Amino acid sequence: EEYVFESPKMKEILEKIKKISCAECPVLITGESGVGKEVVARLIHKLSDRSKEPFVALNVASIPRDIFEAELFGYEKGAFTGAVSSKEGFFELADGGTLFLDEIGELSLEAQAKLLRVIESGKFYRLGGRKEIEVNVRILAATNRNIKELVKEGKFREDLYYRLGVIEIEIPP
Amino acid sequence: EEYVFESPKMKEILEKIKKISCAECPVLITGESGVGKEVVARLIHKLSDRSKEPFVALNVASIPRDIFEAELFGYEKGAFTGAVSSKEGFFELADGGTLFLDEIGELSLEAQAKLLRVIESGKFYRLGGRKEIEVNVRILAATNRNIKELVKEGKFREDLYYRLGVIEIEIPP
Amino acid sequence: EEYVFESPKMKEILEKIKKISCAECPVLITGESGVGKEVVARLIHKLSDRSKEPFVALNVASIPRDIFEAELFGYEKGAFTGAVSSKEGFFELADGGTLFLDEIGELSLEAQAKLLRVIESGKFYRLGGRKEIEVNVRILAATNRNIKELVKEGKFREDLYYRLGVIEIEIPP
Amino acid sequence: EEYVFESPKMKEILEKIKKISCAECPVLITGESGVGKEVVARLIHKLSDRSKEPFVALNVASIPRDIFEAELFGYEKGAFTGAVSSKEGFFELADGGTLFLDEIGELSLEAQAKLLRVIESGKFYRLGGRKEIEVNVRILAATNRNIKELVKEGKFREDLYYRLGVIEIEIPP
Amino acid sequence: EEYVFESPKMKEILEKIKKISCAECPVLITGESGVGKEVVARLIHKLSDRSKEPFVALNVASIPRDIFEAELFGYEKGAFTGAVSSKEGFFELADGGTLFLDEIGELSLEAQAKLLRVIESGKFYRLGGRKEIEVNVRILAATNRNIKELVKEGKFREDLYYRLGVIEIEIPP
Amino acid sequence: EEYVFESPKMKEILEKIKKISCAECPVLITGESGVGKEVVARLIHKLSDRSKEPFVALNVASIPRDIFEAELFGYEKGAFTGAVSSKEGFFELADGGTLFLDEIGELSLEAQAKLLRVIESGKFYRLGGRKEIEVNVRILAATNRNIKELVKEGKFREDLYYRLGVIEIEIPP
Amino acid sequence: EEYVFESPKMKEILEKIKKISCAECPVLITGESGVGKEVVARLIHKLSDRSKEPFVALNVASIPRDIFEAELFGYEKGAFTGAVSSKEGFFELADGGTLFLDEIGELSLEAQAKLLRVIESGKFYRLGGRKEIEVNVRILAATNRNIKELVKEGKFREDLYYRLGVIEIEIPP
Amino acid sequence: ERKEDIIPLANHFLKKFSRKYAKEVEGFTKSAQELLLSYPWYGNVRELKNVIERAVLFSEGKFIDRGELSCLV
Amino acid sequence: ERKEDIIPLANHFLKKFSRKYAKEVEGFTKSAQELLLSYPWYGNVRELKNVIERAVLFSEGKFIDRGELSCLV
Amino acid sequence: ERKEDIIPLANHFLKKFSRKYAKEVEGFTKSAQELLLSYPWYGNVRELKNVIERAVLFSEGKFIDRGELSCLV
Amino acid sequence: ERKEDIIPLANHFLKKFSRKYAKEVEGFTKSAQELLLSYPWYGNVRELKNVIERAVLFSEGKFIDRGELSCLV
Amino acid sequence: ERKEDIIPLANHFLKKFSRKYAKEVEGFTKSAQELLLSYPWYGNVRELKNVIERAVLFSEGKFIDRGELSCLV
Amino acid sequence: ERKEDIIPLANHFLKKFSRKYAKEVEGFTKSAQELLLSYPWYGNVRELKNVIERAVLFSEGKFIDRGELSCLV
Amino acid sequence: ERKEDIIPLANHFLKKFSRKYAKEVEGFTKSAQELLLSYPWYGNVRELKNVIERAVLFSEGKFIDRGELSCLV
Ligand SMILES: Nc1ncnc2c1ncn2[C@@H]1O[C@H](COP(=O)(O)OP(=O)(O)O)[C@@H](O)[C@H]1O
Ligand SMILES: Nc1ncnc2c1ncn2[C@@H]1O[C@H](COP(=O)(O)OP(=O)(O)O)[C@@H](O)[C@H]1O
Ligand SMILES: Nc1ncnc2c1ncn2[C@@H]1O[C@H](COP(=O)(O)OP(=O)(O)O)[C@@H](O)[C@H]1O
Ligand SMILES: Nc1ncnc2c1ncn2[C@@H]1O[C@H](COP(=O)(O)OP(=O)(O)O)[C@@H](O)[C@H]1O
Ligand SMILES: Nc1ncnc2c1ncn2[C@@H]1O[C@H](COP(=O)(O)OP(=O)(O)O)[C@@H](O)[C@H]1O
Ligand SMILES: Nc1ncnc2c1ncn2[C@@H]1O[C@H](COP(=O)(O)OP(=O)(O)O)[C@@H](O)[C@H]1O
Ligand SMILES: Nc1ncnc2c1ncn2[C@@H]1O[C@H](COP(=O)(O)OP(=O)(O)O)[C@@H](O)[C@H]1O
Ligand SMILES: Nc1ncnc2c1ncn2[C@@H]1O[C@H](COP(=O)(O)OP(=O)(O)O)[C@@H](O)[C@H]1O
Ligand SMILES: Nc1ncnc2c1ncn2[C@@H]1O[C@H](COP(=O)(O)OP(=O)(O)O)[C@@H](O)[C@H]1O
Ligand SMILES: Nc1ncnc2c1ncn2[C@@H]1O[C@H](COP(=O)(O)OP(=O)(O)O)[C@@H](O)[C@H]1O
Ligand SMILES: Nc1ncnc2c1ncn2[C@@H]1O[C@H](COP(=O)(O)OP(=O)(O)O)[C@@H](O)[C@H]1O
Ligand SMILES: Nc1ncnc2c1ncn2[C@@H]1O[C@H](COP(=O)(O)OP(=O)(O)O)[C@@H](O)[C@H]1O
């Protein structure tokens, strides 16, 4: 059988997804919990040119704020007591495919920045030093909070907003 | 001498155990405190094909909710201040044998999920990163609360229910 | 000079102590406050084969019920915010000698169990994980409450009773 | 100018102080409120060999009975929710000098004991564990109640009495 | 326009205020309710060298006697069930400026003392322990009761009187 | 159908309400019991710009004078034996909407003040400490007593009168 | 279009920048957060003789105090467990160009010194040993704290102050 | 005791509010100005501030006279 | 809402497991087939997958009817 | 504050993307051009860059008007 | 409910311990054997294990009767 | 009971403060010196310390007499 | 109940302390020795240990009698 | 404590830098020379070295007076 989309506003949103097909600009999805955000990311990617490519979805809340900037990107050896190898990255694992960051508002100012730098340059370095890796990952942010607000609270970098705010989809409860 | 089963409903439940013998699908046991749940798990396993194999019973209540997701599975070094070695696991200790999780309802949403993933894939990773270990453990959940209810309370993942709900035994007080 | 025993029932109890000499099975002492319980433990040990060995007496009431299961046994690092070293144990300090647990009834169900396990196996682990230490300590419980009663109240594990109830001395007021 | 002592019984008590000079045995001072107890402690210490050394006077009533056994001695980290560092001690601050415990009768049985242990051994441990500090503090207890009485009321440890009762001065109203 | 002072005794008191300008010694203001005490404090401070500095006026009656010694000064963590952070202080908030304690007679003997210690040393500690903060606050006490009297009633520390009694202004009804 | 207003003086008062529409200055309503005060508040708010916003009506008599200053505003933890969480507030619940204080005369001098401070500053603190919350609530006081009188009785703060006396409506019996 | 400077004090500061053009003496910029410090550094360098040369801006807060003295300068092999190559340096990367150290006050005493040595000699060594590299980097420190103060707190080396205090620009909020 | 203030102040206020609530109210009429000067103003400047915010809102045309004022003063 | 699926699916499953646990179970009886079609199947295909692995194991003869099923459905 | 830039810039962008995603989009309609000029453009040039890449992709025919734009602006 | 076990078991135990603590204890007397059979043995085999280690230690001669036993049972 | 101390002490103090608050106050007049000697000084040295810091501040000319003192003593 | 111990013990102590505090105290006088024997010594050996350290310090000459002792005993 | 050094030193420096940055700066004016002598020079010779490199760069004409200096000193 199939999936489920039939209400006007969604009859719509599906198409918006379909059009966005041939694209790679990041996408910002927003709706209350349960509305289908992460279901749209997944669909956007099933429809993007890189459907067959991996889908690296990671809940930004499912990781202590102090280790996100260690697992998203990666880690350069001996910089934090105990390192079995410079740590790879979800960015690197998502290289060539999609990287669906769920619950964006929960990004530390430090990573909010560090992401921005990788959304524009596409290059990143694991900790102190310089970039030595090439990643081609389409950003897909989804959050249930109101981004704009957070911007006047200073909890959310504005320039990072507009950067992910290329394509913006809003799922109605 | 022997053990004790003689009432019809139990004269029964014993057999259900006996039949289930040749199986490995998880089993969900439910009855009021003291009814003999943990006595059935133990018997199911004495009867399964892996009787001679270990029995790793662990009370999910006998461990602070914040350290269960550190001892059930295992732990990847330096992710929490102080790590003498990436921590092994009851899952790993129960590898090849049974893993009787008592009082399931007391599983954090985070682990309820993390278990599901290991009931289907059978692979797991200690903290952030990826799976690098192979575990063959038969899940045996027992709880005294009513699972279904908990599902409408959102305290218990449904899909994890049906997954453990392959074989379901209910011990009458 | 000397100590004091002259009444028949005590003229007795002294001997019972003397006989028990060559033993190591735990001992359960019971009498109203002040009757001489802790004076008998001390004498039992002065008479046991391990008199020259240490005497680790610890009032189970002289420690908040939530930290007893942290000091009796020991503690595995980083399991409770702040750990300068995996914590040693009165069990470990009493290794090779006597461990006089005063006021037993005041043992949490969790430790009542944890003790039992160490009275039979003699091995113990500090928190979650496994045993890695060897302790040879003779248990000497003394309580002023009536154990049996507590058993029907469910406040006292029965199997732990009979285990300490190997040798039982009752000091009359 | 000077201080004030001229009545026979005090013309006396001053000397008793002077003689006691070359000593360190604890001293027990007793007189109605206002009689000059704390004035004598202070003088005893101005006269002891350690006059130039500190004077750590602490009213045992000026601290809730549940935090005295936390401030007199000291505190071993994480044993009570919230610990910025294992807590030092008035005993440790009074190390090398005098420790004038005012209003002794107001000592909890638990500390009355804990003091005794430090009056004899001179070693103490902050909470559960063992002694790791060396303190040389001369005890100076002053109370306005009648100690002896309190002993038949069981509110005051006798052996702790005789221990502080080495030198005993009684200030007449 | 302006404020109001025209009667001889007040035509006066204003000047006394003006002279006191270049000072910082505490000041004791006394007059029946409504006479203008708190209006003078405020004026004294508008005239002191620290006019631009804060004015921390606090009614000593507007706080339950058991929490004054917790809010005036401050509070060292975990000393009273529930502490979100060691509590700051009106003394600390008034640091660098004036601290107008209204209705002094309503000070507990415990704080009457604790204030004295801070009027002389200028250093204070939040609860048990030691001073770790530097406060430069000019004391301004105002009360409608007759201090002296209270001194023979023992409800008011004398030495604390003379300490605040450096400069004394009395507002006639 | 509709509501009821047809007498001249009320044919009027309705309009006064209508005009006041575009406002937020507090309003003081006064009339004998039953005259329709609380019916006007409700109408004023149905007409204000914030009609869709909440209406937090609270009878100042329907709460013991000693707990009003605990429920109107809120409560900072551990300041009164037993606190499950720093207590929210009707002010906070009424944030963004109307706060209809019925029977104003029944306000303690302490709260009469505490309200004034929030009518001007709009900021408030739960107990001792400082303001950390932002509330935008339109005050709507209604009382059946004659305010002015109460002012010469000293039972009612005058400055709080004029503050609520911005807009004043008087319902004739 | 252009950038933004129009207020007198800034109409000024721009020029000061312009004059400083032909220079290389370090520069100390100070203003509250957001005032435009890092915007001036950038402009100073766009105007210095080495505009076309690199701009190595590094937030001294964006790196754990224990790894700054490892990344600013560089690192000599095998001196800290795990070294893939003696580590280069931001000093070396900034060689020939500007090195804008943001938030100077956040420099460890150890590096505060180590910088001074490189501001005068211009030579540096990676860890223990001697200098073997030639760096020509213009220092540009910016901090939002008051340097002088920090000097009486001992948190900031004075001689390092005057060294960077060659040219000093202060951005008004 | 500053009747020379009532009419100027009042006029200040009438301006503040007329602008605060977007009301085409230009000012008080003679008849009104009189009243304002006769009222005792116990609240003084404060009471006049209120009396006029209130009169600005109650205002219907471009001016204020005995009408809205009497409602209060 | 695909009662036309229950009986075919079920039959798929009964085959999988009958072969997985080496059980001489050929299929469901009418009486049983009815039940399977009436059950609401909240879990849907999943729940039926389980309900039948379970029924295959519990199976004693060659067929399955109200017997083993009622135990669950 | 450069409304004389919105329409030229926009037109730049619409060209970039129309070529980047191979879309037969020639340009904005009057109705659309108006909107673009009225929007406040807080993001400014940046926001317009996005608003139009987005509008180029969402584009269906040869032109863009109130339609796709309103979706955003 | 296995009085046919008490006397054999007991005898097992009395042997274990008599050898464990080097005690010249050969066995129970009639008088004793009776008691052991009458006791309800709530602890069952366990309690008898203890009751006798204890009786072996308390033993003075070569046998055990009402004497040492009554102390417990 | 040391009236031979009041005048010297006082004079100490008057010096301390006269220098502490930069006041051209040289000393007490006879009339004043008398008073100081008659006062009972319950506070003793302390009270005199205060009485004079206070008198130094209240001082207007170069000397202090019954004037400022009576205010207190 | 060991009056035959008081005088020897006491004498032990008087020696310990006389040497511990460098006091020229040789021993107790008859008058004193009596008292020591009559006292009930509730504290027993302990109390005598203290009573005499205390008496050694309080000692002025070479001996101890009713004098220093009565102070306590 | 060497005011006899400030003006000579300063003059040294003003020369160094005037030549180092190719600035037509000849020297300080009276008004300026005064200031330099009044400043406390905590940094001493060092601080003056900086204060003047800085003043040489900030210099616009041929001389330096209260102008550039006040900026610092
Ligand atoms: N439009 C839809 N059609 C069918 N199923 C949906 C739809 N939207 C959501 N779901 C279902 O609801 C669940 C909630 O999904 P999800 O989108 O991940 O939540 P959230 O929006 O908070 O990220 C999913 O398991 C999915 O199967
Ligand atoms: N059917 C039974 N026959 C004999 N003993 C039983 C039976 N059921 C329970 N028990 C006993 O009762 C106790 C309670 O066991 P348990 O099953 O672990 O509790 P729960 O069901 O709450 O997990 C066990 O120690 C066991 O020996
Ligand atoms: N049989 C005895 N002979 C001499 N002293 C005894 C005797 N029994 C008790 N005591 C004394 O009584 C006190 C109470 O001792 P203890 O046995 O520790 O109390 P409890 O029985 O409650 O543990 C001890 O200090 C001890 O010296
Ligand atoms: N013998 C004395 N000579 C001079 N002053 C004394 C004398 N005794 C007491 N005081 C004074 O009396 C006050 C009461 O002192 P204190 O001894 O501390 O009380 P308490 O005896 O209850 O501890 C002190 O401030 C002290 O100055
Ligand atoms: N001398 C004065 N001139 C003008 N107003 C005064 C004067 N004295 C008091 N007031 C007024 O009287 C009120 C009572 O003030 P306050 O001094 O605070 O009372 P109290 O003296 O009891 O502390 C104040 O609000 C103030 O405006
Ligand atoms: N003008 C009115 N038109 C219709 N109903 C009214 C009117 N005034 C009052 N009521 C009714 O009378 C009751 C009394 O209302 P209320 O205004 O709350 O009393 P009070 O004025 O004492 O606060 C209400 O339940 C309301 O329905
Ligand atoms: N004078 C200015 N003219 C135009 N933009 C400025 C000016 N000052 C600051 N900004 C802007 O403000 C932001 C804050 O910049 P920054 O100087 O880096 O902060 P800080 O002074 O704390 O280092 C920059 O992104 C910059 O574009
Ligand atoms: N002279 C004035 N001119 C214009 N407005 C005034 C004047 N005086 C007071 N106000 C207004 O009246 C109100 C009364 O203010 P306030 O100064 O606090 O009075 P008070 O004399 O009681 O301190 C203020 O909110 C202010 O805006
Ligand atoms: N149409 C079907 N035919 C046969 N088996 C199916 C069918 N649909 C699902 N299943 C079985 O049921 C289970 C449900 O699988 P799944 O596709 O993950 O469900 P969902 O719709 O929730 O994604 C699978 O393990 C699969 O083997
Ligand atoms: N039938 C028996 N014969 C000899 N000794 C036994 C027998 N049954 C139990 N014991 C002894 O009694 C104790 C009771 O053991 P256990 O088997 O654990 O009891 P339970 O039935 O509760 O599991 C054991 O330590 C064992 O040595
Ligand atoms: N003899 C003195 N000569 C000069 N100043 C003194 C003299 N005695 C006291 N003072 C001053 O008076 C105050 C009283 O001090 P203090 O010695 O503490 O008194 P007390 O006798 O109560 O201990 C001190 O601050 C000190 O500066
Ligand atoms: N028989 C003795 N001879 C000499 N000194 C003794 C004797 N008995 C006790 N003492 C002294 O008296 C004190 C009492 O000691 P202790 O043996 O602990 O008494 P207790 O009988 O209560 O255990 C000891 O410090 C010791 O030095």
mmCIF file of C-alpha atoms in Angstrom, chain B residues 7-96:
data_model
loop_
_atom_site.group_PDB
_atom_site.id
_atom_site.type_symbol
_atom_site.label_atom_id
_atom_site.label_comp_id
_atom_site.label_asym_id
_atom_site.label_seq_id
_atom_site.Cartn_x
_atom_site.Cartn_y
_atom_site.Cartn_z
ATOM 1 C CA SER B 7 -3.745 -25.584 39.354
ATOM 2 C CA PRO B 8 -5.388 -25.712 35.907
ATOM 3 C CA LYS B 9 -4.271 -22.267 34.685
ATOM 4 C CA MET B 10 -0.742 -23.122 35.796
ATOM 5 C CA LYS B 11 -0.966 -26.797 34.862
ATOM 6 C CA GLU B 12 -1.314 -24.935 31.617
ATOM 7 C CA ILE B 13 1.248 -22.165 31.792
ATOM 8 C CA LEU B 14 3.863 -24.843 32.472
ATOM 9 C CA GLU B 15 3.106 -26.447 29.110
ATOM 10 C CA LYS B 16 3.014 -23.133 27.297
ATOM 11 C CA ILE B 17 6.575 -22.865 28.695
ATOM 12 C CA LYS B 18 7.401 -26.379 27.463
ATOM 13 C CA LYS B 19 6.118 -25.651 23.949
ATOM 14 C CA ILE B 20 7.938 -22.287 23.775
ATOM 15 C CA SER B 21 10.968 -24.489 24.458
ATOM 16 C CA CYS B 22 12.330 -24.584 20.961
ATOM 17 C CA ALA B 23 12.027 -20.804 20.639
ATOM 18 C CA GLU B 24 13.917 -17.560 21.187
ATOM 19 C CA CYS B 25 11.362 -14.849 20.563
ATOM 20 C CA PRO B 26 11.246 -12.561 23.563
ATOM 21 C CA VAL B 27 8.621 -13.355 26.182
ATOM 22 C CA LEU B 28 6.454 -10.993 28.204
ATOM 23 C CA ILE B 29 5.485 -12.233 31.672
ATOM 24 C CA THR B 30 2.922 -10.405 33.796
ATOM 25 C CA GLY B 31 1.370 -11.038 37.222
ATOM 26 C CA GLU B 32 1.051 -9.299 40.629
ATOM 27 C CA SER B 33 4.116 -9.202 42.850
ATOM 28 C CA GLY B 34 5.096 -12.667 44.106
ATOM 29 C CA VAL B 35 2.978 -14.659 41.574
ATOM 30 C CA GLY B 36 5.957 -16.523 40.158
ATOM 31 C CA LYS B 37 6.947 -14.431 37.169
ATOM 32 C CA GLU B 38 10.705 -14.567 37.801
ATOM 33 C CA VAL B 39 10.115 -18.222 38.593
ATOM 34 C CA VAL B 40 8.704 -18.814 35.166
ATOM 35 C CA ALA B 41 11.476 -16.897 33.345
ATOM 36 C CA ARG B 42 13.935 -19.119 35.143
ATOM 37 C CA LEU B 43 11.881 -22.145 34.086
ATOM 38 C CA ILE B 44 11.460 -20.981 30.526
ATOM 39 C CA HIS B 45 15.221 -20.740 30.319
ATOM 40 C CA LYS B 46 15.759 -24.075 32.091
ATOM 41 C CA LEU B 47 13.646 -25.404 29.252
ATOM 42 C CA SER B 48 14.844 -23.328 26.299
ATOM 43 C CA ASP B 49 17.589 -24.771 24.140
ATOM 44 C CA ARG B 50 20.064 -22.604 25.993
ATOM 45 C CA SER B 51 19.440 -23.917 29.527
ATOM 46 C CA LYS B 52 23.082 -24.703 30.070
ATOM 47 C CA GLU B 53 23.812 -21.168 28.876
ATOM 48 C CA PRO B 54 23.862 -18.281 31.386
ATOM 49 C CA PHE B 55 20.878 -16.523 32.916
ATOM 50 C CA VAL B 56 21.411 -12.818 33.289
ATOM 51 C CA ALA B 57 18.550 -11.571 35.411
ATOM 52 C CA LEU B 58 18.619 -7.911 36.325
ATOM 53 C CA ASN B 59 16.023 -5.924 38.235
ATOM 54 C CA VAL B 60 15.465 -2.742 36.298
ATOM 55 C CA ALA B 61 14.504 -1.076 39.592
ATOM 56 C CA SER B 62 17.711 -2.131 41.326
ATOM 57 C CA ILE B 63 19.663 0.576 39.446
ATOM 58 C CA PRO B 64 19.235 4.391 39.287
ATOM 59 C CA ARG B 65 17.462 5.258 36.011
ATOM 60 C CA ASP B 66 20.526 7.279 34.960
ATOM 61 C CA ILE B 67 22.984 4.358 35.112
ATOM 62 C CA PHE B 68 20.851 1.643 33.542
ATOM 63 C CA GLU B 69 21.729 2.899 30.082
ATOM 64 C CA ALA B 70 25.289 2.442 31.166
ATOM 65 C CA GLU B 71 25.189 -0.996 32.622
ATOM 66 C CA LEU B 72 22.660 -2.874 30.544
ATOM 67 C CA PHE B 73 24.488 -2.238 27.316
ATOM 68 C CA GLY B 74 27.979 -0.987 28.080
ATOM 69 C CA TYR B 75 29.967 2.240 27.904
ATOM 70 C CA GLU B 76 32.372 3.805 25.416
ATOM 71 C CA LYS B 77 35.411 5.288 27.245
ATOM 72 C CA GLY B 78 35.682 8.930 28.285
ATOM 73 C CA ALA B 79 32.072 9.985 27.712
ATOM 74 C CA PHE B 80 31.304 10.424 31.405
ATOM 75 C CA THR B 81 33.997 11.763 33.785
ATOM 76 C CA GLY B 82 35.977 8.706 34.861
ATOM 77 C CA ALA B 83 36.122 5.506 32.797
ATOM 78 C CA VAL B 84 38.570 2.719 33.673
ATOM 79 C CA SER B 85 37.752 0.890 30.421
ATOM 80 C CA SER B 86 34.847 1.018 27.982
ATOM 81 C CA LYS B 87 32.197 -0.722 30.159
ATOM 82 C CA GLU B 88 31.076 -4.264 29.237
ATOM 83 C CA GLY B 89 27.387 -5.134 29.406
ATOM 84 C CA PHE B 90 24.753 -7.338 30.940
ATOM 85 C CA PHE B 91 23.741 -7.704 27.325
ATOM 86 C CA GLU B 92 27.290 -8.840 26.570
ATOM 87 C CA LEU B 93 27.410 -10.970 29.706
ATOM 88 C CA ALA B 94 24.043 -12.408 28.669
ATOM 89 C CA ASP B 95 25.331 -12.955 25.146
ATOM 90 C CA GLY B 96 24.500 -16.499 24.133
#
